Design an enzyme around this catalytic site. Structure first.
Site, PDB file in Angstrom:
ATOM      1  N   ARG A 173     127.764  36.562  73.345  1.00 13.28           N
ATOM      2  CA  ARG A 173     129.005  36.975  72.703  1.00 13.28           C
ATOM      3  C   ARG A 173     129.232  36.192  71.416  1.00 13.28           C
ATOM      4  NH1 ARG A 173     132.874  35.912  77.756  1.00 13.28           N
ATOM      5  NH2 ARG A 173     131.674  33.961  77.597  1.00 13.28           N
ATOM      6  N   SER A 184     139.907  38.387  80.089  1.00 15.56           N
ATOM      7  CA  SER A 184     140.527  37.127  79.681  1.00 15.56           C
ATOM      8  C   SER A 184     140.973  37.105  78.214  1.00 15.56           C
ATOM      9  CB  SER A 184     139.585  35.951  79.962  1.00 15.56           C
ATOM     10  OG  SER A 184     139.372  35.773  81.368  1.00 15.56           O
ATOM     11  N   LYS A 202     144.651  36.630  77.824  1.00 17.96           N
ATOM     12  CA  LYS A 202     145.338  35.335  77.888  1.00 17.96           C
ATOM     13  C   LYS A 202     146.087  35.062  76.573  1.00 17.96           C
ATOM     14  CE  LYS A 202     142.602  33.204  81.580  1.00 17.96           C
ATOM     15  NZ  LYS A 202     141.813  34.438  81.895  1.00 17.96           N
TER      16      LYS A 202
HETATM   17  C1  AV4 Z   1     133.126  35.052  89.520  1.00 17.29           C
HETATM   18  N1  AV4 Z   1     133.682  35.041  88.177  1.00 17.29           N
HETATM   19  C2  AV4 Z   1     135.133  35.000  88.158  1.00 17.29           C
HETATM   20  C3  AV4 Z   1     132.963  34.513  87.137  1.00 17.29           C
HETATM   21  C4  AV4 Z   1     131.571  34.567  87.143  1.00 17.29           C
HETATM   22  C5  AV4 Z   1     130.849  34.022  86.099  1.00 17.29           C
HETATM   23  C6  AV4 Z   1     131.498  33.421  85.041  1.00 17.29           C
HETATM   24  C7  AV4 Z   1     132.886  33.354  85.005  1.00 17.29           C
HETATM   25  C8  AV4 Z   1     133.584  32.728  83.857  1.00 17.29           C
HETATM   26  C9  AV4 Z   1     134.359  31.579  84.022  1.00 17.29           C
HETATM   27  C10 AV4 Z   1     134.975  30.980  82.937  1.00 17.29           C
HETATM   28  C11 AV4 Z   1     134.830  31.518  81.672  1.00 17.29           C
HETATM   29  C12 AV4 Z   1     134.064  32.663  81.482  1.00 17.29           C
HETATM   30  C13 AV4 Z   1     133.828  33.210  80.099  1.00 17.29           C
HETATM   31  O1  AV4 Z   1     134.565  34.150  79.695  1.00 17.29           O
HETATM   32  O2  AV4 Z   1     132.894  32.702  79.443  1.00 17.29           O
HETATM   33  C14 AV4 Z   1     133.453  33.264  82.578  1.00 17.29           C
HETATM   34  C15 AV4 Z   1     133.616  33.908  86.057  1.00 17.29           C
END
Ligand code: AV4
Ligand code: CL
Length: 242
Positions: A227, A47, A50
């Site tokens: 993080r 991400s 983005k």
């Molecule tokens: C199943 N997946 C897509 C998944 C699992 C656990 C957490 C996230 C998530 C969602 C939004 C932001 C963030 C981040 O970067 O803090 C992380 C995504």
């Protein structure tokens, strides 16, 4: 120039973690890291992608401005904040993958590849599916390469309009108080080993800017808050923030 400070390794091992923090002092043009090798190892951006994706979508008119509403497609996903309408600000804040997958499809392979080369972004390789290559395709970027890219964005030197760069920097706003402003983006890469978390961005002070890029091993989602927490511990140790 670059300086390796292994004392920062304590901030990772104290949390049963492994990773790298890279700092860049803009006024002094000097860099600092706990691990020079890992600072130059390339990972999936996940991400953090983005940031460039937003820039390209804005500059091509795929996204008109930061108020345009991207309607939820009505498909229930496991991240509750994804099951709603978003604009560019909230899509960045909640790392809403499906909104950015649609951006990429409208951008298309040819324009995405050309723009990433123009940005000198990572290995500039979009091999894979156009709507997921930053999650499980061929693109890779290191912490030092993230800093190189962010410095261009900060100075409006990327090959997109000034407006597009200003809008993305607005959308990166994460924290602000009387002492500092942080503009940054998180990332979480799970589809290819090693699973890692990212945090990349910068800290604005009255008379200097400190760029940062960190990644760390992330075997489960339980550690995601580390993080930001580890990064801020380094900033506090170096007295960049109180
Ligand atoms: C199943 N997946 C897509 C998944 C699992 C656990 C957490 C996230 C998530 C969602 C939004 C932001 C963030 C981040 O970067 O803090 C992380 C995504
Ligand atoms: Cl702002």
């Amino acid at each position: 120039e670059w300086q390796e400070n292994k004392s920062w390794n304590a901030h990772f091992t104290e949390h049963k973690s492994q990773g790298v923090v890279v700092l860049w002092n803009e006024n002094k043009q000097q860099g600092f890291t706990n691990n020079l090798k890992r600072a130059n190892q390339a990972f999936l951006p996940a991400s953090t992608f983005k940031i460039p994706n937003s820039l390209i979508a804005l500059d091509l008119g795929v996204v008109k401005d930061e108020h345009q509403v991207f309607k939820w497609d009505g498909q229930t996903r496991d991240i509750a904040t994804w099951n709603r309408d978003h604009n560019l600000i909230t899509a960045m804040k909640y790392s809403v993958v499906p909104v950015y997958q649609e951006f990429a499809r409208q951008i298309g392979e040819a324009r995405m590849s050309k723009m990433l080369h123009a940005f000198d972004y990572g290995n500039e390789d979009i091999s894979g599916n156009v709507d997921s290559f930053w999650l499980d395709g061929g693109i890779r970027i290191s912490a030092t390469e993230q800093i190189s890219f962010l410095r261009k964005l900060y100075h409006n030197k990327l090959h997109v309009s000034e407006r597009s760069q200003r809008i993305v920097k607005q959308a990166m706003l994460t924290e602000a108080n009387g002492d500092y402003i942080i503009r940054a983006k998180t990332g979480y890469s799970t589809r290819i080993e090693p699973k890692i978390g990212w945090w990349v961005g910068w800290v604005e002070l009255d008379d200097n800017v400190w760029f940062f890029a960190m990644n760390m091993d992330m075997p489960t989602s339980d550690g995601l808050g580390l993080r930001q927490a580890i990064t801020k511990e380094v900033l506090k140790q170096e007295k960049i923030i109180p």
